[PDB]
Curated annotation (Swiss-Prot), chains A, C:
InterPro entries: Arg_deiminase (IPR003876). Belongs to the arginine deiminase family. Homotetramer (Possible). It comes from Pseudomonas aeruginosa (strain ATCC 15692 / DSM 22644 / CIP 104116 / JCM 14847 / LMG 12228 / 1C / PRS 101 / PAO1). Keywords: Arginine metabolism, Cytoplasm, Hydrolase. The active site is at C392. The keyword Zinc does not apply. This is Arginine deiminase. It is found in: Cytoplasm. Pfam families: ADI. It is an enzyme of class 3 (hydrolase). Activated by Mg(2+) or Mn(2+) and strongly inhibited by Zn(2+). One of its GO terms (molecular function) is arginine deiminase activity.
Amino acid sequence: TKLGVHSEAGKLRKVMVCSPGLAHQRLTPSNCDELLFDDVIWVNQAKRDHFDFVTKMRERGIDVLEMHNLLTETIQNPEALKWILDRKITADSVGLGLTSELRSWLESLEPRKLAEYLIGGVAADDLPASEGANILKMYREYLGHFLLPPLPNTQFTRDTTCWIYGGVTLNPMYWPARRQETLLTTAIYKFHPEFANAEFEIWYGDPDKDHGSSTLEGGDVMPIGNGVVLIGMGERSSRQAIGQVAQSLFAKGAAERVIVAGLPKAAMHLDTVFSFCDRDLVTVFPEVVKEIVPFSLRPDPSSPYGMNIRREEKTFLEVVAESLGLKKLRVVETGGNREQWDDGNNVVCLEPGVVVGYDRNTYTNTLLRKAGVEVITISASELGRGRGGGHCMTCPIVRDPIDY
Amino acid sequence: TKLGVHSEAGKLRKVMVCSPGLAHQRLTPSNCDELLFDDVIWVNQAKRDHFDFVTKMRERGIDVLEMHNLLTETIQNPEALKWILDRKITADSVGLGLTSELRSWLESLEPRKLAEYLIGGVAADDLPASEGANILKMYREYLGHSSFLLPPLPNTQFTRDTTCWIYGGVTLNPMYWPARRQETLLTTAIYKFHPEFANAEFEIWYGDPDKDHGSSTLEGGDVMPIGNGVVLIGMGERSSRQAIGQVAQSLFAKGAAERVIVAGLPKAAMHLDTVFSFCDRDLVTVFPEVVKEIVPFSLRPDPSSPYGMNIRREEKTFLEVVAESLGLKKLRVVETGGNSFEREQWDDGNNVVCLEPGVVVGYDRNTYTNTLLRKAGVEVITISASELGRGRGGGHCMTCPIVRDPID
Amino acid sequence: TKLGVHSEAGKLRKVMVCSPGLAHQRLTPSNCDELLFDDVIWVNQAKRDHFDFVTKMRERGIDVLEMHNLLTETIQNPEALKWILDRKITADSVGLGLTSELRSWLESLEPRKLAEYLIGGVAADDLPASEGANILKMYREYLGHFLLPPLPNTQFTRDTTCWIYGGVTLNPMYWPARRQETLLTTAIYKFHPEFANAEFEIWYGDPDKDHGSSTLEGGDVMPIGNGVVLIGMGERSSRQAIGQVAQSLFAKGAAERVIVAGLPKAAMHLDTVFSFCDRDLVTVFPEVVKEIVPFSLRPDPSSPYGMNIRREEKTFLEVVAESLGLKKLRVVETGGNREQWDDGNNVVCLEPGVVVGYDRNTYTNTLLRKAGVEVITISASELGRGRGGGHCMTCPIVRDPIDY
Amino acid sequence: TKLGVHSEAGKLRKVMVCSPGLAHQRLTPSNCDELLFDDVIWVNQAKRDHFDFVTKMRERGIDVLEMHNLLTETIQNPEALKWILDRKITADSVGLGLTSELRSWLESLEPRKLAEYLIGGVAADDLPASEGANILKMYREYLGHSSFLLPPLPNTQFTRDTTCWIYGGVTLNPMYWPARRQETLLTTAIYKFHPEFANAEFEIWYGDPDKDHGSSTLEGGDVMPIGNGVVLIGMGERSSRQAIGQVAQSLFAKGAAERVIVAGLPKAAMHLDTVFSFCDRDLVTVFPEVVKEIVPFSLRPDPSSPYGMNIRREEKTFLEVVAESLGLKKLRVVETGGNSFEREQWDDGNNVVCLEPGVVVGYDRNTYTNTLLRKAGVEVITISASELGRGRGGGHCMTCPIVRDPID
């Protein structure tokens, strides 16, 4: 069937993931912050753990797309490579004296190796002996100063693109360095076979424009069903983006309502404090969720900009309940800073009441089980060494609707 | 005389500064960091000190242009306002439901008031009452969201940051923080439509507000046309190799320079003018800790190269290199800053701005360095640092030389 | 009359202050944090500003005691010097190979110079040529590593000792390095003429004991009158200290009630968010004060520990109002992160409606004036370059009561 | 055999470790920092890995003492419990209105449970209901105050920190953070009343829980009795000259050492064992960046001195000095850590604990360093670092050698 995500809990048929790899190999305690990644991880173990995650979904018949594979195949079309390289390798990003050598060398590589470098970055050392490479090597040695920076956050495929019903967003990331990730995913959606001939809409976003203060991040976006879309507004998703995203969905009739979850204020996305596990069940970080201010945004013909907004009176949990035609949501609280502390938010639902979470979250997983949910677990030693879990590491593409 | 800056110590004939103002009135201990500014300052007092600074240069014959004055004049030209608002007010910057009412209110303001708002930002409260404006207030009240439709630009006070005149050409610098590009947009509008500039002859070496410069960044404090065909450019956290190379290549292309000395700063973000400053023909202040570690690189034009230049690491200290580049046996050097060290109190006397050889404007508080500067032969005019130097300020950061005579 | 502080707004007759000096001269951007001081200041200007502050109170007949003078005179009694030096110079603080030279040299100095070193610290460089001094000089040069550390916070005389009615507390400071300040002030209260023969009680504290988790800081303590004492409980004043302080005051009948202002949670003392200006007027940082939880602590004969505690129902501002027999307090709000922002809290009251504040706080000072208060101002360029104002820089010793 | 540690690589005969436990169950992202611990760990898994660590040493004949076991045994002695509670429960530490009920509840517990609480802390909730306990809950609820009557001591896991056996004598270290002195109090109680110790012969070189040590601080990770009469002691943010001098003077007074090499760490707090570790007679791991900058100082006893010792800065590298002090031409060296640098992934293999010459216990994750250690001749037994090494851990920090044979 047609590409599209119709809820948070419906049967998952196709999802995109990206395994840890070269990017993470380039991590050092000293370059972590600038690479916008929490810490250094045991790469090979992380790979085995991500593989076990991938294997567990596949064994239940889910089609799991891995970003490195998709990129490797996209890149085999001369036009797609050209499209990425034209944007990725310029004087402004690489430098005058390196664009030509860097591109010639990249272009000579085998498909899979080239894809690993596009995601894992390129160091002066990878280049064949050259003056340019040499000057860079000097700045590193003499000044402590990558031609192409590694993109360790690709592992979190939820961040950069969002499938909302019969369409996708190409999210204008908060940190400029992360726009490199949205660039490669866009190349995939543009040129790859799984996408090029498939019907779907591009609701918002474009790697070729600036967006300025308009920013959107995957963790904040959820098409919950019933023509509704939840979008968290906080440190990473701005009102400027959300409005344009809503106007676009409305203009095409793709949605009836967009519920803006206003987060109070440490950057956090909606999915790190709120997640679905079943038709009427959710985990929650009580501390934030009870302070969320819900705003309803609806299509309005008598308005210049074509929509109107209303702050909702009830709590966010009541607003979401009613929007799904539910009397109330069953809620499992987690996080908070009872053997020990744990934060079981951010699990990824495979189908109603079937979830994948982390092994460490024993208390919370026990509550989810007691609440009727089957919890499949994977190791978090390296994958969840910092932020995000299953939800963060998956980008749903085809997920069936649920109901009223 | 033709626009252009030909040294660091020559006679300053014309300069741009910008007085602290509405932008600073909006500072708060909690929005400080996000507005890239060190701390809340007493604005009315800052203004009085800024005016004393301006008055002390003007009194000496120097033409001193106030950015607020220039901008108020500029925006009286309809095409220039439009050019500015087309780029500053959009659905991406302001939101779909605020663009028209905000643009209409601005265009209905008196020139002076309009210019104060362009530099000082616009809060939801400043608009005439309305639906769109009420929701922003609600975001600020119920969520604690910043209420600025148009963010304030308190850093405008440091006119040195966004544009550098290098020998009769200027650079419209691509700042490190995207927010600060809003300053360059306004300074560029002035250089473009204002009488003092639109009709003058000069080159635009590098830069452009309509383009995204990616990883190519350049900040004023790092640029120094020391003369004798040479240009010093610091390379550290704020000025990247990617920018420096294109600036040089552009300068070489028109023969405006013979050499670019890349001052390689090791590693807290700091510009060259923050640890190194000229006071006279052969005299400089220095923060030893950083300077003794700067790695120098000579960048010269070279026809036998695909990209037109060559680069050579220098084996002698950065100080010996600057010396040799200016035809001197040795630079006289005054040490300052230290965070450790002989003397009554710690102080940092770097960043004075030179008015003429041996005449400098400095801060009243740096009593030690100021007297070591006097003993070394310099007349030091002082201004109050209580508010202006409440952080990384300095007379050098607060001035953008437009016309400065050469030396020798 | 007898030493003692009977309110926050009564006529101030005797106060102790301490001018900026050698301690501040030893400040560098790199040693500020470890010296527990906010920033480097223009010492000579700070001195002129502190002098202008001192002069303004004296001109209104207030007896202003300056710590350097008191110390200089105390130190002229052989027994007082010995008492301080025995505690200040030990193997554990100075090192085995330096105690003897350091003490001999200090002991040879003239009274005033010796007092300046006891407060301003001693550097290896001040010592006469020696091997010891030399090894220290080596560690500084070769390793970036003061014999006696400077005490730049002495300028804030309110921090270390508190006069509560007919007695004083010798506060067990939070940061161990600051206990050096309480040591010198205790020597003054013990041996100096102004204190040695004066009648007063030592309610709590002792520089010769440990106190562990018991900590108290001046900014949190206020004897407001009517037998009541307000004591803020937050990051710097602990329940362990407050209880012992209350039990002592009760045991001597020095107070009828102690109102614990419970501060929510960046360390803050009560006086930085709450201050008196007149019999019924106070400035306030609304953000904190409205969240303060008031607890009343009273003498109770039927209890093992001799007191009982009750959380109060009403706001803290209503609780304080009633405890003074006032219908309500008039309140001037300030701070908050209207030309510009300012935080006018922490002014020091000289008499009802007569206050000393900082020149920069124009908005707030204007409100205080409109509220009937005469505001004398001093420069804050260096004195209030960071925390505290007039209140923080004064330690009241004799202040008359006010009324019902 | 007599208690005492005579080298870093000799055969380990007896060691103390402490398993993660209740203390860690109380960790939270917001109380982490205040409890001086890097992050929240999965406690049950940490315990399983700790046990694998313990089991791997025991299986080799090593007597491994578990601090929880030792403490449970100790407190069965009435005089030892009293000694401990007299010092741990007071009006200053717990508050006037909680001392008696808290002391009574503790004394009513079963030994094992009591010991878990002494190391793991006590929350208001653990007490039988009462007035005093309810007010603490109220402080925690209405004010967000920590609810710990007795703070937890998650750092107990690093038995290396609080006490060092140096040649048949031990140091009861005065920690940098006052909170951590509560660990030393408990370890001292064990060394004092426990059978394995009360009756053994050994010296107490330095330290004492009943005294305030002012600015004199010493941390385990900095101490290393490398043998041949020599002792290495790192001097940086955690071990001060004031302590080091008295430790040396005490060692010299009884002739337990001929020399103390002060390893001067430049300048993030770090102990010597964190950047430098022995693996064999002549082999050490090293974090170059720090090691190449350590300034060595030799401290020898000297009768012609008022304070009994002399100090001399060494002109050769710290590595050449350690070499010469052990009768070697050169130490074989394996580099690790770097935060920059040739190899598949970054790792830091410092802090392995040696069981015998060339036999070491390390972490599974440090694959690069581990194989460079094997190529250099070392058998590397590995344990899981997911929870235990979730920060500054390491096998060396997790062991407090009691009996270790000399080498040569």
